[PDB]
Curated annotation (Swiss-Prot):
Reported tissue expression: Isoform 2 is expressed in normal intestinal tissue as well as in colorectal carcinomas.
Inducers of expression: Up-regulated following treatment with IFNG/IFN-gamma.
Stretch of the intact protein here: 3 to 302 of 1430
Gene that this polypeptide is encoded by: DAPK1
Complex and partners: Interacts with KLHL20. Interacts (via death domain) with MAPK1 and MAPK3. Interacts with MAP1B (via N-terminus). Interacts with PRKD1 in an oxidative stress-regulated manner. Interacts with PIN1, PDCD6, BECN1, TSC2 and STX1A. Interacts (via kinase domain) with DAPK3 (via kinase domain). Interacts with GRINB. Interacts (via death domain) with UNC5B (via death domain). Interacts with UNC5C (via death domain).
Function: Calcium/calmodulin-dependent serine/threonine kinase involved in multiple cellular signaling pathways that trigger cell survival, apoptosis, and autophagy. Regulates both type I apoptotic and type II autophagic cell deaths signal, depending on the cellular setting. The former is caspase-dependent, while the latter is caspase-independent and is characterized by the accumulation of autophagic vesicles. Phosphorylates PIN1 resulting in inhibition of its catalytic activity, nuclear localization, and cellular function. Phosphorylates TPM1, enhancing stress fiber formation in endothelial cells. Isoform 2 cannot induce apoptosis but can induce membrane blebbing.
Family membership: Belongs to the protein kinase superfamily. CAMK Ser/Thr protein kinase family. DAP kinase subfamily.
Ligand binding (ATP): 17-25, 40, 92-94, 98, 159
Transmembrane segments: none
Active site: D137
This protein's name: Death-associated protein kinase 1
Annotated region (Autoinhibitory domain), positions in chain: 290-299
Effect of K40A: Loss of activity, apoptotic function and of autophosphorylation
Organism encoding this protein: Homo sapiens (Human)
Origin organism lineage: Eukaryota, Metazoa, Chordata, Craniata, Vertebrata
Length: 300
């Protein structure tokens, strides 16, 4: 059971900010404080038999995950309402748009500058994993900015509709997510855990440095074969001004066996992320993101 009052008693709701299949997001303003939020209206599935709406079980999972988390790089739940047909999540307002679109507006980006945005994603996932929460849905459109018009912008990780508590005593298996971004164990209906987020971080980093999707094929089913076999390459047309350390980073994340894939702790320590000496910090300032190609990717 959630707040029963009419959301309109405490909030002035405004214009639409987007819409998944089962949700509408509007801008809103809390009457008692004048602060701005965003109200996500999730459609309740009313009859078990129905394909429309979201089950109570899926909403309660999202909400109790969201209630549980408090960190500068993940989105904050303010408050939760419900009525006959919806569950209404009052969420923090993330106004800066997708990180990839903002990066596409620069004249260039060194591997050094890129690592500073990526450190923010790494910190968010670090916090999550330390609470045994797997996001299960990391992809660029879920990496946002609080505010784009400031010196050093803050990354916000959004969208917990797929997130789960990993419980030590029981396998979790499922197929879900976007084919280009999901790990092999997801594709193959094998046991899942925190390692899937690590594979998605690999896919994101690859795209950030090159503007190419590592596993994207000509049809959905080709993309899945690509993922499952770990069929990827660093082709020179894309990666020829990309350092050895960045390549090694991606390679330790894009790995079929999840027990052998890098952990979140391991990756905060990797020498691409934390240089150990002058040669390593040099060649990271010296290396550039492939900007011409990258811009094209955020353009599609």
């Amino acid at each position: 059971v959630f707040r029963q009052e009419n959301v309109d008693d405490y909030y002035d709701t405004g214009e639409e900010l987007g819409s998944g299949q089962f949700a509408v997001v509007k801008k809103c303003r809390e009457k008692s404080t004048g602060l701005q939020y965003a109200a996500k209206f999730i459609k309740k599935r009313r009859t078990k038999s129905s394909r429309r709406g979201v089950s109570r079980e899926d909403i309660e999972r999202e909400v109790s995950i969201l209630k549980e988390i408090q960190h500068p790089n993940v989105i904050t739940l303010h408050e939760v309402y419900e009525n006959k047909t919806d569950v209404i999540l009052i969420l923090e307002l993330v106004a800066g748009g997708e990180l990839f679109d903002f990066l596409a507006e620069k004249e260039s980006l060194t591997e050094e500058e890129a690592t500073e945005f990526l450190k923010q994603i790494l910190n968010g996932v670090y916090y999550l994993h330390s609470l045994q929460i797997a996001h299960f849905d990391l992809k660029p459109e879920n990496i946002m900015l609080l505010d784009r018009n400031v010196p050093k912008p803050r990354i916000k990780i959004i969208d917990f509709g797929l997130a789960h508590k990993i419980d030590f005593g029981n396998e979790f298996k499922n197929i879900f997510g976007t084919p280009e971004f999901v790990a092999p164990e997801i594709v193959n209906y094998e046991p899942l855990g925190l390692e899937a987020d690590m594979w998605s971080i690999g896919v994101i980093t690859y795209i950030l440095l090159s503007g190419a999707s590592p596993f994207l094929g000509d049809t959905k089913q080709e993309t899945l074969a690509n993922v499952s076999a770990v069929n990827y390459e660093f082709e020179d047309e894309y990666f020829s001004n990309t350092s050895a350390l960045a390549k090694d980073f991606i390679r330790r994340l894009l790995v079929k066996d999840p027990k052998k894939r890098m952990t979140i702790q391991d990756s905060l320590q990797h020498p691409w992320i934390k240089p150990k000496d002058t040669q390593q910090a040099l060649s990271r300032k010296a290396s550039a993101v492939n900007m011409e190609k990258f811009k094209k990717f955020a353009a599609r």
